[PDB]
Amino acid sequence: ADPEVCCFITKILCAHGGRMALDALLQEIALSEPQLCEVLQVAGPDRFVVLEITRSVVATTRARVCRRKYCQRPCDNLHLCKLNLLGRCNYSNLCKYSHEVLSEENFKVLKNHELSGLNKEELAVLLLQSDPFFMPEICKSYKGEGRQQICNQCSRLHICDHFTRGNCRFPNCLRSHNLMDRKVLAIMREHGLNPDVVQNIQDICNSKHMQK
Ligand SMILES: [Zn+2]
Ligand SMILES: [Zn+2]
Ligand SMILES: [Zn+2]
Ligand SMILES: [Zn+2]
């Protein structure tokens, strides 16, 4: 409920790689177990994903980076260079995406999502595991696991697209929802996402699937 306490939890979580065991989190926030559990439950799975009895908390957000190459303002999304946010922009010729992570316009977007207290490092951790735009490209010719051809040829992800966006309508979906697969982890690793980050994405995407 309290945005200052919530932002503070997001901050501590992002400093520990977007995930913490409930016990290690309690040691940093200095609250009691059902007192913290009240805050997490009230904030909901759009801010914190709680999984199991050894409990872990995963930070998330509804904030997204605008996907357009050239965006006509006003726009309610963040505008930044993903590569720069991750410290890998080898173009800045001038890059068409902002290198000012906490720009005036982004700062307003963060206030709307109650994340204006974050620094650029915490924002990078949060967005990498919450925003699907940070994920490698998904093979458009992939249609499921029990077919003649898995795809038309490729290097892209052979995973359910809708699952990554939190809207897989199929309850017994035959397109893979397992991002923890060796082949997926190999493509993720080459894109700059390590298995700890993929595990967080997996648990956020699992949570979004169980909440329709
Ligand atoms: Zn935009
Ligand atoms: Zn850039
Ligand atoms: Zn393919
Ligand atoms: Zn699916």
Swiss-Prot record:
Q: Where are the transmembrane segments?
A: none
Q: Which domain of life is it from?
A: Eukaryota
Show the segment(s) annotated as N-terminal domain: 1-212
Instruction: Give one GO biological process term.
Output: positive regulation of type I interferon production
Where N-acetylalanine occurs, the residues are: 1
Q: Where is this motif: Nuclear localization signal?
A: 62-69
The name this protein carries in UniProt is Zinc finger CCCH-type antiviral protein 1
Q: Which species is this record about?
A: Homo sapiens (Human)
Q: Which gene encodes it?
A: ZC3HAV1
Span within the full-length protein is: 2 to 226 of 902
